[PDB]
Amino acid sequence: SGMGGIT
Amino acid sequence: SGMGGIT
Amino acid sequence: SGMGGIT
Amino acid sequence: SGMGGIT
Amino acid sequence: SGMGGIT
Amino acid sequence: SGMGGIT
Amino acid sequence: SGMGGIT
Amino acid sequence: SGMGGIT
Amino acid sequence: SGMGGIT
Amino acid sequence: SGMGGIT
Amino acid sequence: SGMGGIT
Amino acid sequence: SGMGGIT
């Protein structure tokens, strides 16, 4: 599992 | 603005 | 399970 | 404005 | 189960 | 199961 | 505007 | 399972 | 703008 | 599994 | 602006 | 702008 994003 | 998450 | 969004 | 959730 | 929305 | 949307 | 989800 | 979107 | 996800 | 995107 | 994550 | 990911 993990986390991430785009901005 | 942005999009993201944590699994 | 997790959480996320778009703004 | 936005959309999101927690499962 | 969980929660979420759109605004 | 899950959740989602379009706006 | 956007579309997305969590499964 | 996971999450994703388009904006 | 963008598109992305986490599996 | 993993994560990725295009912006 | 940017995109990134942690697995 | 860019595209990328983590497997």
Residue numbers in the entry:
A (entry chain B), B (entry chain A), C (entry chain B), D (entry chain A), E (entry chain B), F (entry chain B), ...: 58 to 64
Task: Quote what the paper states about this structure.
Although other intermediate filament proteins have been demonstrated to form amyloids, KRT8 specifically has not previously been characterized as an amyloid-forming protein. KRT8 is known to aggregate pathologically, primarily in the form of MDBs in liver disease.
An overlay of both wild-type–mutant structure pairs highlights that mutations from wild-type glycines facilitate a transition in the backbone from a non-ideal, highly extended conformation to a pleated one. Suggesting an effect of alcohol on KRT8 aggregation, two of three of our crystal structures of KRT8 segments showed the peptides in complex with either ethanol or isopropanol, each with distinct binding sites. The wild-type SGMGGIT structure (a) shows two ethanol molecules (gray) per asymmetric unit coordinated to the N terminus of the peptide, while mutant SGMGCIT (b) displays isopropanol binding alongside the middle of the peptide along the fibril axis, occupying the space between the beta-sheets (in gray) in the steric zipper.
